Design a protein around this ligand. Structure first.
Ligand code: 11U
Ligand code: CA
Length: 223
């Protein structure tokens, strides 16, 4: 997260870290058994880490739970990142509490101009590399579709939206991948892609979660 601030420990209790010997992606807890992340985060051997603040220090509120299965969206296209969403099931149910909590799925999509919260443990520099060990947060508005498409011609689909700042300086970044964009108490986006981080006229691009609620509810009820 570039140009953000320290969230404060467990203030974003639905945020998870996916670990395979190291943190490599964010995710969002949607109920005691299931995590939503980006399809480009897929790998086997995932451990889900809940209740984290400092991902390098055991602070006392963590739950570490192996994934039992992953389900990548049936139409995910790695080349275009269209339908960049996956579900991950926990081998055992998380114990929900005030530091380990689910985020609600939307009942409808958000509007352009709605303010959101984007969070993660990714790089905090727009030139160079620095990874924080505590969770970082960013307030960012949903941008118009026309500013999004103008920034990235021929590359935005109906399953994507832009959020952030066209002047730059504030953005998500590598390592934030798969994490939440929460707007008005709902998970509306997943950190997906962009050009560099915090660059002028290159805002972040997010998976448009409202398009997938039916798929999500049908898939978890059948697995
Ligand atoms: N908000 C940001 N600036 C931002 C930028 C990048 C990332 C991390 N995501 C990524 O790097 C993702 C996954 C691997 C390929 N990838 C890409 O961004 C690769 N370029 C894309 C262009 C559009 C068509 C699909 C490919 C996460 C956030
Ligand atoms: Ca920790």
């Amino acid at each position: 997260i570039v140009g953000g601030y320290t969230c404060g420990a467990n203030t974003v209790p639905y945020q998870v870290s996916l670990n395979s010997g190291y943190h490599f992606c964010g995710g969002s807890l949607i109920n005691s058994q299931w995590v939503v992340s980006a399809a480009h985060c897929y790998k086997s051997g995932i451990q889900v880490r809940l209740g984290e603040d400092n991902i390098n220090v055991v602070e006392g509120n963590e739950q570490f739970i192996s994934a039992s299965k992953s389900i990548v969206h049936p139409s995910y296209n790695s080349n275009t990142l269209n339908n960049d969403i996956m579900l991950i099931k926990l081998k055992s149910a998380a114990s929900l509490n005030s530091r380990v909590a689910s985020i609600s799925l939307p009942t409808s999509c958000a509007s352009a101009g709605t303010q959101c919260l984007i969070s993660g443990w990714g790089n905090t520099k727009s030139s160079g590399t620095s990874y924080p060990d505590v969770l970082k947060c960013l307030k960012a508005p949903i941008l118009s579709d026309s500013s999004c498409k103008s920034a990235y011609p021929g590359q935005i689909t109906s399953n994507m939206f832009c959020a952030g700042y066209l002047e730059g300086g504030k953005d998500s970044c590598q390592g934030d991948s798969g994490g939440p964009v929460v707007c008005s108490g709902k998970l509306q986006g997943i950190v997906s892609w962009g050009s560099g981080c915090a660059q002028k006229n290159k805002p972040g691009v997010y998976t448009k979660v409202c398009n997938y609620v039916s798929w999500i509810k049908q898939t978890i009820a059948s697995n």
